[PDB]
Structure formats: C-alpha cells, structure tokens
Ligand binder design. Structure first.
Ligand SMILES: *[C@@H]1O[C@H](CO)[C@@H](O[C@@H]2O[C@H](CO)[C@@H](O[C@@H]3O[C@H](CO)[C@@H](O)[C@H](O[C@H]4O[C@H](CO)[C@@H](O)[C@H](O)[C@@H]4O)[C@@H]3O)[C@H](O)[C@H]2NC(C)=O)[C@H](O)[C@H]1NC(C)=O
Ligand code: ILR
Ligand code: ILR
Ligand code: ILR
Ligand code: ILR
Ligand code: ILR
Ligand code: NAG
Ligand code: CL
Ligand code: CL
Ligand code: CL
Ligand code: CL
Ligand code: CL
Lengths: 216, 209, 213, 208, 206
C-alpha cells in the first residue's frame, strides 16, 4: 500500500543521510597512529592452488581474505536512522588497511567487487578475492608429504605501534577448496608473527600463510 | 529531432539530478535481479591447471521505482541508453573465477519507463574446471556459481527467466561442442552467517568437437 | 604572428561554445536516429591459433557520423572549417565486435576530427582476437572466418550502419605477413536475435586467407 | 633564496597553465623534431612476424604560449612538468601489433623560449618478417612514425640526422644492428587530399 | 584518541596546501635495494626478471613541522599521490615495472620522506654462464629520467645490496650484488648525470 511505498522511500532517504553524515559531515579517517592504534583481524579461505611452476619457483593461489577492523568515526545509533544496523559501501568511500603479501612475484589480481560492509558499532568487513603469484619451490609436490610453501601478509607501511593483526583461528578455511584442483591441500595454517627487524626498533606484525599440498 | 533531443536530456537530468540517487538494496527495500547466460564459446580447457575459459554475454535485469517516468511527460520517450556509471548496478560475481573477468562490451545499459534496467555485459571468464573426460563421448562437466559478492538474500534475490542456457550464439566451429548448459537458482545457508545466500549455478557439459 | 593568437582564440571559443555551453549529446533516439558509416583497412593477420580457434587481426576502423549539435558557421569562428579533439570531448558510437574472445587493444590515439557541417571522423586502430577456426589455412582454398561489428546497445531504430564499399581496404595489408588475403568483404546486415525484439544492424567482416608460401 | 625559487617556479607554472592551447592548425602549424635511440631488439617472432624493439623517442617542438621572460621569474630558464600539464603530439607507429608499453616517466622539459623536449622510452611490437636474421646479411624491417590525426598542413616532422643513435644499443642483445636509419617521408594516401608526414625507422639486424 | 586524530588531520591539511627540485633548490635521493628473488632468466631474449624493494629517502623544508604544534606527532603515513616523489627509473628495462606494494610513504617532522616500492623488473641481461662456477653478471642503472645532477643528487648508504631477505629456494643464488653511485658527463649535455648501478652476479642452484 502507500504506507509500504512511503516506508521504502524513508529507508532510502535514511541510508543516504547516514552515508552523508559519515562521509560528507566527517572527514575521511587519516589512518591509525601510535596514539590511536588499530587491530585488523585476517582470515583466509583457500579456494584453489591453480599452478605450481618448478621452472620459476612461483605458485598461484586463489583465496578470499577476510579483513575486519573497528573505527569510532564509523559508529551510529540505529534509532537515529530508521533502525539501519549496517550498509554496503564502495571500498573507495572508507579507509582500508594496506595488507600486502611480502613475497609476491606479480601484482595481486582482484577477483571480487571493491565493496565493504559497515556495521553500526563501527566494524568494517571487507572480503577481497585474489589471485596471487608468490615465491614457492614446488619440489616434492609429486610426493606423499607434498611441497610446503609460506607467504607473510601484513601492513607495508605501518609497524605494530599503529597496526596490529589478529586471527580468529590458525586454521585456513578449506571448506570452499576446489575438490578437482590439480593439487590437494594436506594442511593450511595462518599464524600471527611479531618480528623485530634490524632496520627499525618498532616490532612488525604479519600473518604467515603456510600451505602443504601435493598433486592429486 | 531537436525537441526529441531536449526531451531525452531533460529526462536524464530529472532522473539523475532532480531525483535523489538510489543507494542500493536493503533488508527494508530488497531487489530481485534476473540473470541469464548466452554461451558464445569454450575457448580453452587447460588440463595442466584445471582452468577453463568461457566467452558469454550475461543478461542482468532489475526494476527501480526511482527510474520510472511517464512517457507522455517526455514526448513518448519509452526508453534510453545510459553509461552504467550513471546508475546503480548489481555486484554479480563468479564465485570460482581464477582471473579477473575481461569485459568485451561497452558499459552501457538500457532504462525503460517502468523503471526496469537491462545490462548485457559480454565477458571472458577463467574458472576452476577439471576438463578430464573432454576427449570422451561422455565429455566433461564443470559448474560456476554467480551471485552478489556483498548482498545476502535479504537485500538481493536472484531469478532466471529459464533454466536453459541460450546456445543460439554458440560458435559452430568451437574446439568444444556443448552437450548441455543449465542456469539454476540455488539457496544456501553458510556456517558463518544465519541469513540465506542466493546464486545461479551455471553447469556446462562439453567435449572436443 | 598576432593573427596566430586570434586563430587560437577562435578555436578555443568554438570548442567552448560547442562543449562548455551545451549539454553533451545524449546519443541517438527512435525519433532522431543516426547512420554511422564504417570501413575496415586490414593491416595484418598476426596469429591463427588452431588450439583455441582464435585469430588475431590488426586493422584500423574508420567511423563517420554527423550531429546537428556539432554544426557551426565558419564565418563566426575566423573561418575554422574543422578541428581535432579528444574522443572524451564528444559522443562516439559503441561499435563492438560480436564474437571477440579478448578486449580489443587500442593502437592509436583517442582523437577525432570534427568538421563545421557537424560530421565526425574517428579511426581507431585495433588488435582483435575473435572466434575463427583456421582449418585449411595451409591449403590452396585457405580458411574463411567472419566477425560482425555493430552497436552493442542500440537497435536499427536508433543506430543504422552503412559502408561506402563492400570491399575491405587491403592497400595497407602487410606484404610480409605469415598470411596472405584471398578476399576481405564488409557487408551491412539487418538481423533479429533471441535477446531483443527490435532488429539490429551490423557490418559482417568476412576474411579468406592462407599461409604465405 | 630557495623559498623564493620555489615561489617563482610555482607562479610561472600557475601563469603558464592556470592563466592562459588547442593543438596545431593550418594557420598555426607545428614542426616536431623526432630522433630515435635504439636500446635493444628484444625478440623476433618468426611464427607471427612480430619484432619487439626497446628505444627512447626524442620529441621537440616550440610553442609561443609556453615562452616567458626569465628576469620576470627569478631567472628560471627551464622547468620539468608532468606531460599531462601540456599539449603533446600524437606521434604513432603505423604498424604496431600491440599497444606501446611506456618505460619512462611522462615528464617533459619546458624552456623559456617555449621549446619542449619529451623523451618517452617505449617497448614496441611491430610487423616484421625476420627471415634472414640467422645469415651474414641479416633481416631488414621498417616502421613509420607520424601523427595519427594531423596531416602535413598542421604537423610537419623533421629529424636532426637520418642516423638512429646506436651509442646506447645493448652490447649483449640477441641481435646485433647492421644499420638503423630514420628518414622523413611525405606520403599521399587514396583516403585523403592532404599530404601526411612520417619518419621511417629502418633497422637491419642479425643474430649475434 | 579523538584529539590525536584531529591533530593529524590538521597537520595534513596545513602541509598539503611542491614543484620538484631546481638548480637553486636541489634535492638528494638516497637509494637502497633489497633483492628478494631472481624469478627467471630468458636466454632466448636476454631478459632477466628481478623482484626487490627499492628504499627511497629525500628531505623537503616544505614537509617540516614542529611536533609540539601537533600533539607530539613525529610522523605520518600518506598516499604517494599527496606528495612529490622522484622519477627514479631503470635505464634498461624491457617491460613496465610491476608495483607489488601500496603507493604509501612515511613523512617525518624533519621533512624526510621514506618510500619503499616493491617491484618486479624485466631488464636487459645475458644469463650465459649462469650454469657455470663463475655464474653470470648483469647490471642495470637507476636514476632520474628528466633531472640532472644539478637538480637531483643520488647516493647509497652502502654499496652492498641487502641480501638478508633473498628467497632461500630461488632458482638462482646470488654470488654478489652491489649498488654504486656513478657520475657520467654525456656528450649531449654539459651537466653531470647521476645513477646507481645495480650489479648482480648469480648462478643456478646445484
Ligand atoms: C504519445 O502516446 C499517446 C498515447 O498513445 C498519444 O496520445 C493519443 O493520441 C492519439 C492520436 O491523437 C489519440 O487517438 C484518438 O483517440 C480518440 C478517442 O479518444 C479518437 O476519436 C481519435 O480518432 C479520430 O482521429 C484520428 C486521427 O487522430 C482519425 O484517424 C480517426 O478517424 C478519428 O477522426 C484518435 O484515434 C489518443 O486518444 C491519445 N491517447 C491518449 C491517452 O491521450 C500521443 O499522441 C503520442 N505522442 C505524443 C507526442 O505524446
Ligand atoms: C613490511 C615491510 N615494509 C617495507 C619494507 C619491507 C617489509 C616487508 C619485508 C620485511 C621488511 C619489512 O620492512 C619493515 C618490516 O618488514
Ligand atoms: C558471495 C560471497 N561473498 C563473500 C565471501 C564468499 C562468498 C562466495 C563464496 C562462498 C561463500 C560466500 O560468502 C557468503 C555467500 O557466499
Ligand atoms: C550486439 C549485441 N548486443 C547485446 C547482446 C549481444 C548482441 C551481439 C551478439 C548477438 C546478439 C546481439 O544482441 C542484439 C544484437 O546482437
Ligand atoms: C596517419 C594515419 N591516420 C589515420 C589512419 C591511418 C593513417 C596512416 C596509414 C595510412 C592512412 C592514414 O590515415 C590518414 C592518412 O594516413
Ligand atoms: C636519464 C635519461 N633521460 C632521457 C634519455 C635517456 C637517459 C637515460 C639513458 C642514458 C641517457 C640519458 O639521457 C641523458 C642522460 O641519461
Ligand atoms: C573568411 O573567408 C571569407 C571568404 O573568403 C571572407 O569574406 C571572410 O572575411 C573570412 N574571414 C572571416 C572572419 O569570416
Ligand atoms: Cl573510514
Ligand atoms: Cl540507479
Ligand atoms: Cl558530441
Ligand atoms: Cl601546452
Ligand atoms: Cl611534497
């Protein structure tokens, strides 16, 4: 009826007003600082090992990387905006962490839309699907124990004073792993690491993705 | 002609400036997107990586109240063509691609006076597919799901007009002949999330010509 | 040299009155349809892949159309009869290969020539991969392949196509190509498709070629 | 002084770019000088008759709209600026088989007399039959460079020499250069009543 | 926490509203290479592919600020598009550089900037002898494309390439890697030209 039509128009005007009040009325987040540090939660869902190149020692993964963080500057009261509890927005509208593979051999290829979900408590969920080429000797992939390769993910420019990383579990999600991949996964772990490098006194944080796989 | 041109420029200005823009679907304002595939070619089947490359055009249809107009107010313009950047479009994504989709057609949609939008992107898609059996009579079978990347069934529903893939543009001298191609709406509940997720499952059975 | 400053001022004034002081052309309509003339100049068959049935062409595609909204009196603009402009400053037709297997690679600058009668000429050079079975390319008869070109989104009621000639221009064809051209035609076609109710117009590029020996 | 030098350059660029060019015309034609420095023949593909060159292409022209009095801007005689800030000529290979790959920053040098020097490094794949490359006499291939959209009436081309600069050619290339010339040509095509100008790059090379 | 954000936002605003170096306002760029991998060596085309991160440091008076005026903020991370960056270019690449890291730099209160682009580079290299004891040697020069030694000086902190992150299971082992400032007076141009010459000696793992 007209009431239902009015409620939909109101829901749209409420969303437009909330996104306006966060992005127009408030200047985009400048990123974390030693005084305002930020924990990014990382999680990997490994979908496929596409290729293992023994001629270059490069391996190609397809996965989706779940990133979660929380900003005060993104909080709102659902009761002020028609009980809007969350919204979808272009990743370009918000700050996103510079989470980078430390040993890629090619630019990451993005396989999913650059859109995130923002929740009223100011939490952000961003799940980019990627194809990655990284440094990996596949020697042993034709063996019972298979090959093992590792790649570290972390901020490229922020130390542990500004950006901390967390995992919810050290088990890579394999529940979406392609059943007819050329490679079967023997194990996949994601482990937070704290490193002190010689360059700099600040500790650095990464999540180490370790994959054990063999030819099916 | 100059009147017709003025009427279309007025219509586009009314819809894109003078009306507030649509912010995407919500739980309170859900959207149904109709998907259909027209399969043009299986270009390549890589048994070294279990990747298959398809070329198709994907018809996407949806309807917004904010894109409606009365043709009698605009010299009986009943539709127009517009850049996809001008309007909201659904984030329809292959779930098991191995490479970024390559777009083969212009980013232009058709808007009709009832507020319905038709967008027909042609794509080259690399996806996870074991072609084992392609050189046999039974051929190989591969599947890829398509759906919203970021919207659940509470904001975007999917439908097909038919579960038969359109094979009317399938390349007659392809390396691969199609034994069957179906497109089937599926509802799934993942462990992560309590709300339902919707996809369309493209299932292709094919063999060497 | 003073005149040169006036000539530049005139062209800048012309461009400004055409682009800055008007809303960009919204494209053709059923009431105001547009005829685009196409011609292909085939430069090279670079590659014929028998493993995927894809062939790679290099050509430049001449596009010509005419808009009243681009007309000017040369007398009001220091007798300027035409100008070069970025393809981003003007509407251009969405002429698309029907059966490409990869995005077209653009080999020439995105610049067109606008003439005082409102006529535009745009000549994009392209490398195109398209669906083609090269079986018989190593035979006397050679191989035959075809690819249609037309608006992706506009039917025959909004965009009509014509050619000046049904013969592809082979005058620039690379003499030391791996493939020699037996024939190349470009032919207007009016067709109805399963996707859409109204007729669409294309130019069918048909190429018969064989290994150079 | 240094603070004043920055202020002067910023004001000059502001005056040249923000205060004040639509490209050349019949009434205001432009001469572009081209020179090639051939760095490497990377690859010769006898399956497709494509050859890949790496070179830098020196482009020079002079605009009245870019000249200034150095005395009026702290004796600044030249400056570097992004190529996007200025008009640049649409010099195009006539017979490329792939889009040119740009290897150098899109930055030009502008001088107080309004002269501009832009030196893009490029990897180019072009139409070339390398038959004979494995012989003493080697292979010969040629590629024309010129404006895509401007006839000889708007853009004239010049070379300083017909000799391609080989002083930077890669000494351990798979291919040695026997000769490399760059020749201005005036061409009439059946399409067009205006003459068109190109520089014909001709390279004779063999397997080392 | 809200005060720290406010202060950082204010600083960025004040700083961001540089035309590059000049003879009168010259710049020094410090370069250091951290070689991660020789991915492949192509003897059919004499191209080699390196993966490394290139540390770039320079200092501008215009980027200096007093920390006490901005709540003890000693530095900030910013998009490379917000600031001037030097046009450091490989002189003998055969393909455009592929950028493997985010275009973000660190700006410090003294006006210093550190930018560390990770890159994959294809460059001119004959790998002949890579399968011998002596290995193969290749070199590539890095410098400003458009600025002379009058506007941009280049230097290295050390002539030893950092090999401490070199991939242990690379197809190629490094026998030595050096990064050496060179001054060259070309014929065309009376002013000195500065590059850093990256020289890598490598051989197949046995
Ligand atoms: C846009 O579309 C609208 C709606 O289709 C259209 O309005 C319609 O115009 C037609 C023609 O003027 C109208 O048709 C008339 O209907 C009346 C009954 O109401 C008839 O009696 C008329 O018949 C006489 O006139 C005919 C010629 O006009 C003769 O051939 C005939 O023998 C009779 O003498 C006639 O059929 C119609 O009523 C309207 N409809 C509405 C809803 O108003 C409009 O013209 C179109 N164009 C534009 C720019 O808007
Ligand atoms: C995160 C990062 N950023 C820039 C340089 C490279 C790297 C990553 C590889 C190890 C060193 C490093 O530096 C500091 C800590 O980690
Ligand atoms: C559509 C989507 N978006 C983000 C995570 C991955 C994925 C797609 C693969 C299966 C799970 C999934 O999650 C919820 C619905 O489907
Ligand atoms: C040009 C075009 N536009 C949109 C869908 C696909 C296509 C091209 C392939 C055949 C059908 C078609 O539809 C109508 C005309 O031709
Ligand atoms: C320079 C140029 N521009 C547009 C198409 C191709 C070409 C060059 C090959 C011959 C025809 C041509 O067209 C006009 C005159 O020259
Ligand atoms: C840095 C540079 N810029 C433009 C042309 C090429 C190059 C680099 C290769 C050697 C010569 C050179 O020219 C002058 C000094 O250095
Ligand atoms: C253009 O040419 C015509 C005829 O040759 C002449 O009358 C006129 O003065 C010229 N200039 C202008 C500004 O119209
Ligand atoms: Cl944000
Ligand atoms: Cl919309
Ligand atoms: Cl236009
Ligand atoms: Cl200019
Ligand atoms: Cl700066």
């Amino acid at each position: 009826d007209y009431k239902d039509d009015d409620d939909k128009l109101h829901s749209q005007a409420n969303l437009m007003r909330l996104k306006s009040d966060l992005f127009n009325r408030s200047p985009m987040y400048p990123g974390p600082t030693k005084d305002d540090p930020l924990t990014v939660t990382l999680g990997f869902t490994l979908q496929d090992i596409v290729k293992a190149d023994s001629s270059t020692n490069e391996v190609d993964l397809v996965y989706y990387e779940q990133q979660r963080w929380k900003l005060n500057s993104l909080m709102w009261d659902p009761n002020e905006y028609g009980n809007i509890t969350d919204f979808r927005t272009s990743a370009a509208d918000i700050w996103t962490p510079d989470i980078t593979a430390y040993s890629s051999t090619r630019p990451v290829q993005v396989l999913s839309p650059q859109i995130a979900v923002v929740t009223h408590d100011g939490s952000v969920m961003f799940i980019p699907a990627q194809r990655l080429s990284f440094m990996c000797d596949p020697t042993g992939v034709d063996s019972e124990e298979g090959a093992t390769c590792a790649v570290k993910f972390g901020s490229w420019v922020y130390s542990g004073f500004e950006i901390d990383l967390k995992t919810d579990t050290d088990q890579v999600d394999l529940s979406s792993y392609y059943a007819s991949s050329k490679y079967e996964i023997l194990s996949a772990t994601q482990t937070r690491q704290v490193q002190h490098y010689s360059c700099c006194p600040e500790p650095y944080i990464d999540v180490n993705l370790v994959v054990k796989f063999r030819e099916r």
